[PDB]
Copies of this chain bind each other. A is one copy, B any other.
């Protein structure tokens, strides 16, 4: 819409109050004109037709419980855009300030959220397994990172390349959660998963086996479910990335951590310069080593820690 840029206030899914960028033109819309070509949030009104209607509000205050998922989708797309711009100098997901669109209230009792190739879609959850999925900043950033991957490496969504695609989304989702300093951790989806159980999450990067996912290449899933294990086999790369960052000893192999910032620079470089649509785990290892070499020198500690981490999860 064409209108005047302004700032409204609301409450997110977890009850926290935040300011959000809106646009006024008769109604106040969730349209943020301060980032790129804009961030737009739509109401899918419990249907599956997309994108739905651009979210319109009469008084620029979003404290209704129906508003909550929209406030967080809109705000956490802004935080994720800021992370990529400020940290990696990337303007939106295509590198050219493409508009970011999200729809909330998709379907009824839908326990998922996804990037569909053109926009973000968030279910409200069934209220038992999940609450509205845009309340999790790592979920929002995980999904928006699939848009980045689609425009750069183009990793296909199955077998080892799909597992890399999922891991890259977990890694950057977690780095955005640390960037916003929102009670950060190495788990995925813990703010919106099972409201009735404390302490769990959908997946763990620090210990993937907690939830039964593999933490070593010898335990990888080889069947056909889950598009050849894209959500399952991503545990192997998540654990490598946690070790590169944090260090540790894993199956016998000791890794010195180099921190989150360098982890993010190495993987971002590997993703935008060396990975291709059919890259497998062994070519991820080569790409990460080459990236760390480009950035820090072939005899750095950074290169040595990337090698040790992939050796620790059995990826040669």
Contact = CB atoms under 8 A, between A and B. Distances in A.
| Copies of the protein in its oligomer | 2
Interface residues of A, number: 22
A51 B107 contact: no
A97 interface: no
A278 B110 CA distance: 13
Interface string A19-46: 0000000000000000000000000001
Given A116-B116, A116-B117, A118-B118, A150 B48 contact: yes
Interface string A127-167: 00000000000000000000000110010110000000000
Contacts of A51: 118
Contacts of A108: 156, 277-278
B109 A48 contact: no
Question: By CB atoms of chain B within 10 A, which of A121, A156, A157 has the most?
Answer: A156
Interface string A109-127: 1100000111001000000
A49 interface: yes
Given A116-B117, A117-B116, A118-B118, A47 B109 contact: no
B109 A156 contact: yes
